[PDB]
Amino acid sequence: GSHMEAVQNRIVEAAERVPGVRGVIHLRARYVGQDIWADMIIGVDPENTVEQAAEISEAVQAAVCGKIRRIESLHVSAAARE
Amino acid sequence: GSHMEAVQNRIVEAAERVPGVRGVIHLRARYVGQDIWADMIIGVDPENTVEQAAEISEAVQAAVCGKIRRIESLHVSAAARE
């Protein structure tokens, strides 16, 4: 839906405002009732530690869920991006 | 509607993140089709100039409309608040 594209835009913008995010590589969002469940991959510095990449991913989870209240499940993984 | 309260929450938060805003005193939002038309009053420093208060109001108009894409009309006035 178009309202869905509005939501996906908000998710991408929210994630890209988090320190350490090198773009959103992938985002799949779906409605479960009125709730959004979503899975996303962010880009990170290949020289970040795995621990740092996990910290960024968690920061993205908190930022995105803080800004888009209809999200009730959000998984964030990371991949190296230059 | 409840989705309307979500929109009003987003409007208030967006406005209160603008430098110079001393809360949202009043916000009336209504749907015109799928678009939001809204009228709001912000609080400002009573010692700001009228020109400064107009600048803050314009900054609020741009910030709110930038964050909530469904808004197609937004009027922002200001009043002194301590």
UniProtKB/Swiss-Prot annotation, chains A, B:
Q: Which residues bind Fe cation 1?
A: 39, 75
Q: Which signals induce this protein?
A: Part of the probable 17 gene mamAB operon.
Residues where Fe cation 2 binds: 54
Spell out the disulfide connections. none
For the region C-terminal domain (CTD), give the residue spans. 5-82
Q: What is known of its domains?
A: The C-terminal domain (CTD) is probably responsible for hetero- and homodimerization; it assumes a V-shaped, dimeric metallo-chaperone-like fold that can open and close. Val-50 forms the hinge between the dimers. Binds up to 3 divalent metal cations (probably iron in vivo); upon binding there is a conformational shift to a tighter dimer. If the CTD cannot fold correctly the function of the whole protein is decreased, suggesting the CTD confers functionality on the transmembrane domain (TMD), perhaps activated by ligand binding to the CTD.
Which proteins does it associate with, and in what oligomeric form?
Forms homodimers via its C-terminal domain (CTD) in the presence of metal cations. Interacts with MamB via their CTD. Isolated CTD forms homodimers.
According to UniProt, the name of this protein is: Magnetosome protein MamM
Q: Which organism is it from?
A: Magnetospirillum gryphiswaldense (strain DSM 6361 / JCM 21280 / NBRC 15271 / MSR-1)
Q: Which gene encodes it?
A: mamM
Included stretch of the parent chain: 215 to 292 of 318
